Ligand code: HEM
């Protein structure tokens with residue numbers, strides 16, 4: 001689903017308030033994500049054993065990713081008026097994560113959900129249905145473009161996904 | 173290993189050697205891992221010492237209290253953006269056209285949209301180097317100082333060339 005102009009401008013304004021604290025917000029997002037989904041830490045050699053969120057917050061590798069994530073998303077959000085630019089930015093991010101980092105797409109789905117949870121909580125006083133819908137669309141946009149990029153490089157998404165163990169007595 | 177005369181030129185060059193690049197990249201990564209706090213500290217130091225530079229920022233140009241400046245969303249957003257753009261430069265120092273493309277974009281935007289006097293780039297870069305020198309005072313033999321001096325000169329030379337290109 002495509003953002004209307006009003007939806008775009010709402011997201012852009014809300015996002016700019018987050019980006020003014022780019023690292024505190026990115027770190028909060030990532031820590032919440034890793035605490036809730038420790039399997040996602042597998043990709044990060046320097047914090048894959050960390051359990052304590054206080055320790056995670058101070059991990060340089062985590063913090064660098066937090067800063068890079070916020071920068072990349074900032075480029076997306078500032079350019080939402082330019083669909084072709086949005087597509088190119090997310091295609092680069094997607095292809096890098098598919099090919100260099102080999103990240104399971106499930107982690108993009110999940111992280112995008114965490115971002116939305118953090119926004120809904122940070123802006124709970126200012127989050128009516130119109131604004132909720134705008135952010136939901138942005139989540140969809142991010143995941144859609146990233147998965148398209150994975151498909152383009154030949155990642156074949158499976159149902160059940162690739163990580164799920166086999167049923168001992170399956171059914172069709 | 174180059175000839176002596178080519179070494180003499182590498183010393184005055186714009187471009188960082190592989191050894192200089194790796195030094196800068198390693199040290200920079202420590203700063204970028206604290207992108208927000210470092211960027212904000214850099215800008216607040218800059219504006220306190222160079223209040224004339226505040227003029228370009230419509231939402232904090234009137235502020236004299238450094239505590240208020242520090243909390244200004246416009247200042248903080250710029251701090252994050254500066255750190256992101258510099259990070260792109262440092263990570264791509266091996267690729268001169270990528271460095272040039274990032275710094276041309278920045279330079280032309282600041283010349284044309286923001287109408288910033290180019291000297292402020294020289295000044296701000298200086299402040300970045302001060303903050304680096306403070307963070308790393310032990311890991312800093314003369315060659316390491318020189319590597320950062322070259323980065324500063326590289327940034328300013330690219331930006332000034334972008335200003336000239338757009339007819340500043
Ligand atoms: C909104 C979603 C995300 C964005 C915008 C994003 C963006 C970035 C960027 C810009 C970089 C640096 C350039 C590069 O090395 O490719 C990066 C690196 C990386 N990303 Fe992401 N990322 C996202 C989600 C994820 C997820 C879900 C994972 C795994 C759970 C992940 C794992 C990694 C890893 C392992 C690196 C390399 C880290 C390192 O070298 O220290 N990313 N990401």
Ligand code: HEM
Pocket residue numbers: 225226228229246249250253254255257258278281282285286288292293296297
């Ligand atoms: C390392 C040097 C610098 C870098 C890498 C840098 C980078 C950036 C970037 C990426 C943006 C956002 C995109 C844009 O609007 O152009 C920006 C905006 C801006 N920059 Fe810089 N900048 C630097 C130095 C300066 C200096 C020295 C000044 C003035 C003293 C300045 C004034 C501005 C202004 C006024 C904006 C627009 C801010 C807004 O609309 O909220 N910048 N800069």
